[PDB]
Amino acid sequence: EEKEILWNEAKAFIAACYQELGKAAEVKDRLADIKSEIDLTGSYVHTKEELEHGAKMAWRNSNRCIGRLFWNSLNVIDRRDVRTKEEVRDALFHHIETATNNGKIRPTITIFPPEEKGEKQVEIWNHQLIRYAGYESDGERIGDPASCSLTAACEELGWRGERTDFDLLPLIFRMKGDEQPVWYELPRSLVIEVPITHPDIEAFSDLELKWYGVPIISDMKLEVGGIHYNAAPFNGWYMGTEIGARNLADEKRYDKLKKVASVIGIAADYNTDLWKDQALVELNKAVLHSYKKQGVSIVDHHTAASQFKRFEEQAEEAGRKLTGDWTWLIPPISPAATHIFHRSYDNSIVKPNYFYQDKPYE
């Protein structure tokens, strides 16, 4: 059955991919070649073209992604050649460098060897390649609570964080045949960070907030034509609200709203003062201003929704059904000020696509 599922997904992917690439006449012989290779080997190897276009299609089919206008410009790095943890490490390092691009962020994915019999060749533990550690001991809370369980697991393995609120987690991943993962400290020269200041309010620097430049999701499975690339880290640039309205704002993350209200000089005592809303706006202004001042790519939620509207029009122009998850597309502040809020979206799953997978710790 495994092989039948593979074949079915393969024929659907190859016909749609080759059609988009103006390569329709080659489907027949390519599908023949695939059917044999599946027969003979239990799987099949994607060509460079299939692999690149598949990763791009997967982004285009990502229902929760507002940044999909730029799906066709994805920079695909084919690292199916790696066999050593040193090669994996260097690949991850390179991905950080090339994607960061001195602040002018390049949407990028690095693709590692896929699962074989559902057996992972390479298993990445980080949620993002660059993220901050989190600690909770006897009432004492430091850093990013979303990172508490991975942090605890790294420290099991002999890593030790400095216990600032912004400790960079090491890269941590496991190789097929290894019982334990390895970890490598990130070279600080590879990691761009932005201090958060506000354009008008000087006291805002008293918060000593910062965030990293490039979010690189490293724990999702890329699925293309029945082949499961469980290790395939990818990045775009941030939408400001991800940092200003969630990472720094949520009570279960950095929980900064009360401190924000204090430095902007408003009381945080009455719901009817809308001090949370006001702190949200200033914090979010500060984040966009800071990334822009430093020369690090970022987009605001209004601009991003305007791009997504273009993505919708483009899909219609091309004859493709549009899919989307309304609950994730609406931004977490002023959602009704975007067109997204005022329409609905078909949440069907189309492949290729990126999927969640179980975490090896926890």
Ligand X SMILES: C[C@H](O)[C@H](O)[C@H]1CNc2nc(N)[nH]c(=O)c2N1
Residues comprising the binding site for heme?
A: 65
Total binding residues for ligand X by CB under 6 A? 6
7 is catalytic: no
326 is catalytic: no
Burial of 178: CB neighbours in 10 Å, binned 0-12, 13-18, 19+: exposed
Q: Which of ligand X, Cl ion, a copy of itself, none has residue 257 at its interface (CB below 5 to 8 Å by kind)?
A: a copy of itself
9 binds ligand H36 (CB under 6 A): no
Per DSSP, the chain holds a count of helices (H) and strands (E) of 10, 16
50 is catalytic: no
Give the per-residue contact string, 203-242, with a copy of itself (x = CB under 8 A; - = no). ----------------------------------------
Given the residues 59, 183, 237, 275, select the one marked as catalytic.
237
CA angle (78 as vertex; 129, 64 as ends), nearest 5: 55
Instruction: Restricting to residues 277-336, name those near ligand HEM by CB under 6 A.
Output: 299, 304, 328
Nearest residue to 255 (alpha-carbon basis) of 160, 175, 106, 146: 146
| CB 72, CB 311: distance < 8 Å | no
Amino acid found at 242: E
The residue within the footprint of Cl ion, chosen from 107, 114, 181, 215 (CB under 5 A), is: 215
DSSP character string of 305-317: HHHHHHHHHHHHH
Instruction: Restricting to residues 229-248, name those near ligand H36 by CB under 6 A.
Output: 234-236, 238-239, 242
320 is catalytic: no
Q: Which of ligand HEM, a copy of itself, ligand X, none has residue 292 at its interface (CB below 5 to 8 Å by kind)?
A: a copy of itself
Amino acid found at 52: E
362 binds ligand H36 (CB under 6 A): no
- 3-state class (DSSP) for residue 132: strand
62 binds a copy of itself (CB under 8 A): no
DSSP character string of 199-262: SS-GGGGGG--EEES--EE-SPEEEETTEEES---EE--EEHHIIIIIITTSTTTT--HHHHHH
59 binds ligand HEM (CB under 6 A): yes
Least Å distance, CB 191 to a copy of itself, is 24
Active-site positions read 65, 68, 237, 242
